[PDB]
Design a protein around this ligand. Sequence first.
Ligand SMILES: *C(=C)C1=C(C)C(=O)N/C1=C\c1[nH]c(/C=C2\N=C(C[C@H]3NC(=O)C(C=C)=C3C)C(C)=C2CCC(=O)O)c(CCC(=O)O)c1C
Ligand SMILES: *C(=C)C1=C(C)C(=O)N/C1=C\c1[nH]c(/C=C2\N=C(C[C@H]3NC(=O)C(C=C)=C3C)C(C)=C2CCC(=O)O)c(CCC(=O)O)c1C
Ligand SMILES: *C(=C)C1=C(C)[C@@H](Cc2[nH]c(/C=C3N=C(/C=C4\NC(=O)[C@H](C)[C@H]4[C@@H](*)C)C(C)=C\3CCC(=O)O)c(CCC(=O)O)c2C)NC1=O
Ligand SMILES: *C(=C)C1=C(C)[C@@H](Cc2[nH]c(/C=C3N=C(/C=C4\NC(=O)[C@H](C)[C@H]4[C@@H](*)C)C(C)=C\3CCC(=O)O)c(CCC(=O)O)c2C)NC1=O
Ligand SMILES: *[C@@H](C)[C@H]1/C(=C/C2=NC(=C\c3[nH]c(C[C@H]4NC(=O)C(C=C)=C4C)c(C)c3CCC(=O)O)/C(CCC(=O)O)=C2C)NC(=O)[C@@H]1C
Ligand SMILES: *[C@@H](C)[C@H]1/C(=C/C2=NC(=C\c3[nH]c(C[C@H]4NC(=O)C(C=C)=C4C)c(C)c3CCC(=O)O)/C(CCC(=O)O)=C2C)NC(=O)[C@@H]1C
Ligand SMILES: *[C@H](C)[C@H]1/C(=C/C2=NC(=C\c3[nH]c(C[C@H]4NC(=O)C(C=C)=C4C)c(C)c3CCC(=O)O)/C(CCC(=O)O)=C2C)NC(=O)[C@@H]1C
Ligand SMILES: *[C@H](C)[C@H]1/C(=C/C2=NC(=C\c3[nH]c(C[C@H]4NC(=O)C(C=C)=C4C)c(C)c3CCC(=O)O)/C(CCC(=O)O)=C2C)NC(=O)[C@@H]1C
Ligand SMILES: [Cl-]
Ligand SMILES: [Mg+2]
Ligand SMILES: [Mg+2]
Lengths: 67, 177, 173, 76
Amino acid sequence: AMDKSAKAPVITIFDHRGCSRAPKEYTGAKAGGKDDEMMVKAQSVKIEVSTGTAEGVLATSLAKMTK
Amino acid sequence: MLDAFSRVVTNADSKAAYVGGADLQALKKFISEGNKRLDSVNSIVSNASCIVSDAVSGMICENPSLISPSGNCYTNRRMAACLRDGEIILRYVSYALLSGDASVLEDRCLNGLKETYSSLGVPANSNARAVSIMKACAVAFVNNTASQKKLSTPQGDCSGLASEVGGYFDKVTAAIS
Amino acid sequence: DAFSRVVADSKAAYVGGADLQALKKFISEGNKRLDSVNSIVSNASCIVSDAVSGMICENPSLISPSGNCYTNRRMAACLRDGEIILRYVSYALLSGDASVLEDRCLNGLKETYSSLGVPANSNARAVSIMKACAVAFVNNTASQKKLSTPQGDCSGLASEVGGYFDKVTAAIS
Amino acid sequence: AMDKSAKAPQITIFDHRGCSRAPKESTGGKAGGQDDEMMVKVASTKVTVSESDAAKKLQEFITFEKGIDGPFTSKN
Ligand SMILES: *C(=C)C1=C(C)C(=O)N/C1=C\c1[nH]c(/C=C2\N=C(C[C@H]3NC(=O)C(C=C)=C3C)C(C)=C2CCC(=O)O)c(CCC(=O)O)c1C
Ligand SMILES: *C(=C)C1=C(C)C(=O)N/C1=C\c1[nH]c(/C=C2\N=C(C[C@H]3NC(=O)C(C=C)=C3C)C(C)=C2CCC(=O)O)c(CCC(=O)O)c1C
Ligand SMILES: *C(=C)C1=C(C)[C@@H](Cc2[nH]c(/C=C3N=C(/C=C4\NC(=O)[C@H](C)[C@H]4[C@@H](*)C)C(C)=C\3CCC(=O)O)c(CCC(=O)O)c2C)NC1=O
Ligand SMILES: *C(=C)C1=C(C)[C@@H](Cc2[nH]c(/C=C3N=C(/C=C4\NC(=O)[C@H](C)[C@H]4[C@@H](*)C)C(C)=C\3CCC(=O)O)c(CCC(=O)O)c2C)NC1=O
Ligand SMILES: *[C@@H](C)[C@H]1/C(=C/C2=NC(=C\c3[nH]c(C[C@H]4NC(=O)C(C=C)=C4C)c(C)c3CCC(=O)O)/C(CCC(=O)O)=C2C)NC(=O)[C@@H]1C
Ligand SMILES: *[C@@H](C)[C@H]1/C(=C/C2=NC(=C\c3[nH]c(C[C@H]4NC(=O)C(C=C)=C4C)c(C)c3CCC(=O)O)/C(CCC(=O)O)=C2C)NC(=O)[C@@H]1C
Ligand SMILES: *[C@H](C)[C@H]1/C(=C/C2=NC(=C\c3[nH]c(C[C@H]4NC(=O)C(C=C)=C4C)c(C)c3CCC(=O)O)/C(CCC(=O)O)=C2C)NC(=O)[C@@H]1C
Ligand SMILES: *[C@H](C)[C@H]1/C(=C/C2=NC(=C\c3[nH]c(C[C@H]4NC(=O)C(C=C)=C4C)c(C)c3CCC(=O)O)/C(CCC(=O)O)=C2C)NC(=O)[C@@H]1C
Ligand SMILES: [Cl-]
Ligand SMILES: [Mg+2]
Ligand SMILES: [Mg+2]
């Protein structure tokens, strides 16, 4: 069911091939190739929107509307 | 099902889950079109704020009464809730695209959603337009026919994945319209 | 006068009707100029986001633990500054003048950035990406276009806004 | 001088020709034409970005994707 929590799956796709910052978060088995420099992250997160963002969208909308 | 993400998708905990290395090699052969699929997800979610804001502001420029004093986006509170919902929907669509399956979208986002909107008076025609703008954004990011110089990915034809993501948006539209 | 007071007087200036007619007699190419300003201002969030994102994608060390955008606090300040700069440039274009941009945004800015350690080459890149965005919006050649403006040449206004960005670059580089 | 207050001009351009929401905010009377349905507003407001919003932006930025416009210039 839609549970009214305002949570959603936040996916972060880290294709960091060639990156000098070493992987460390993933601790499962290694591939022995470029898959060791890439990762999919997912996390359940409450989605929030600020009043500043809301104000910005309001201003954009007023400026872009005509009639 | 993506087993590493089972607790993510049930909101069972707030712990991050990680798929790299051999687990990622395997994920890409579990799902189809693996590299392109992950590129497609990346191009959508990395542009989420803009997709949602452009969709909501476009919904509004087409129907300005939404931010009149009687409209359902009037006040920062209502605008923020609408932007939030657009993002929730977009993120569930992005999970459908990551996994290649609409189930989590249907079950954890869409089931019961229309009845909530009906009870609140969230206008379904306007909501459908926000969703159709988001869909258009996603299809353009996935099936981006600009030259190699302008793409973050090796050039090739991602029209199939664009059609697939479009179908997930269509499931949202059918559920809430 | 009304805008100058605002940018000595605390409340906003609302310039419509006959006052708008008068405004357009004292700025060059008034109608085109207001279209040009709106094309930037109404798209400000994407302009700032794309510029900061591009600054970072060109130099990811900026969000490493030793980079100047590390922590939400610092990232927030950088996003904010991009917006501040874009706002002053946009007001220069509205007013047809650089005096407020120079006095209120640029004079003293490099000294502040030097003391903070805000990296000048990275900052210059954020500004240059915003410049490219603004030129395209003025000329209505960005990917997101205004549908129905009367066609004509706004290259003069595009040059003018480019010059305001160049003042920013010169001041902070 | 740059006064460190984070205040900057905030412009709203309203080309609201034909809009059914009646104008009520002008103070200088009527042009007798379409300027009577258009307005430039300028305020001086503090620019603020919350830490939580900056975190949302970082989660987008860290993946080195782009918008439709521009060349792809990342090496990562
Ligand atoms: C290369 C790009 C980078 C340069 C150059 C630099 O200065 N920083 C670079 C990258 C960078 N990465 C992080 C943070 C995270 N990266 C990952 C993903 C990697 N971890 C893994 O285990 C694997 C694969 C097996 C990866 C690929 C994750 C999960 C994080 C943590 C953050 C998150 O958003 O979850 C940063 C941020 C600062 C830091 O932690 O170093 C940077 C800038
Ligand atoms: C037409 C577009 C609209 C439809 C249809 C609808 O339902 N609402 C529409 C417009 C709309 N306008 C505002 C708010 C303001 N508009 C102005 C500018 C006008 N006022 C003037 O005096 C003149 C010219 C002489 C104008 C042109 C201003 C200043 C505001 C107030 C808000 C502000 O940002 O300062 C709204 C918002 C809700 C409301 O106030 O009615 C809407 C949706
Ligand atoms: C009000 C006058 C009004 C709008 C506001 C605007 C809304 C709108 N937007 C599109 C389509 C797209 N928007 C896109 C968004 C983005 N591209 C980027 O590069 C950034 C990161 C991000 C945020 C701005 C994209 C990719 C698209 C798709 C390509 C395209 O331009 O069409 C539409 C079209 C929707 C459709 O096709 O049904 C609309 C309506 N338009 C307005 O009129
Ligand atoms: C990181 C992987 C990375 C980027 C992020 C990106 C940065 C980049 N962007 C430009 C140029 C433009 N960006 C524009 C922005 C927008 N256009 C829209 O329609 C939306 C609303 C808005 C936000 C996305 C625009 C208009 C331009 C100019 C386009 C043109 O000229 O027609 C550049 C180029 C900067 C330069 O020329 O100096 C760059 C690098 N690229 C990345 O790799
Ligand atoms: C539509 C989606 C795009 C497009 C995509 C292509 N991507 C190609 C290859 C490719 N992408 C990745 C990165 C990807 N794999 C991962 O594991 C992760 C993250 C965890 C990501 C983001 C890789 C590793 C590869 C393969 C190696 C490479 O070529 O770099 C690709 C080419 C191969 C193919 O055709 O199958 C394409 C076409 N291309 C486009 O033009 C649109 C915009
Ligand atoms: C570069 C900016 C553009 C371009 C712009 C042109 N706009 C022209 C005319 C025009 N624009 C407006 C709207 C403007 N005036 C206002 O007072 C306000 C808001 C307060 C705005 C947003 C008006 C009223 C007009 C006059 C015509 C009309 O009645 O609509 C225009 C025509 C020439 C001119 O008037 O000088 C041009 C060329 N055109 C382009 O092709 C680029 C991309
Ligand atoms: C934006 C395109 C819309 C619009 C949206 C509004 N939604 C409002 C309330 C609301 N939305 C949901 C669904 C949301 N919560 C979840 O947990 C999930 C999925 C898991 C989703 C998609 C709920 C449950 C509620 C009520 C509770 C709440 O807000 O947290 C809403 C009203 C907000 C308020 O008055 O506080 C709005 C304005 N409105 C529009 O006009 C367009 C069409
Ligand atoms: C983003 C593209 C940058 C970047 C920017 C940072 N700026 C930081 C602080 C800061 N900025 C200003 C100037 C600002 N305030 C004003 O009043 C005006 C104009 C009227 C402007 C343009 C000030 C005065 C300050 C310091 C006081 C404050 O934070 O408000 C900042 C924080 C540094 C720190 O706390 O460590 C950052 C990160 N950083 C980057 O890496 C790119 C290049
Ligand atoms: Cl676009
Ligand atoms: Mg099922
Ligand atoms: Mg990449």
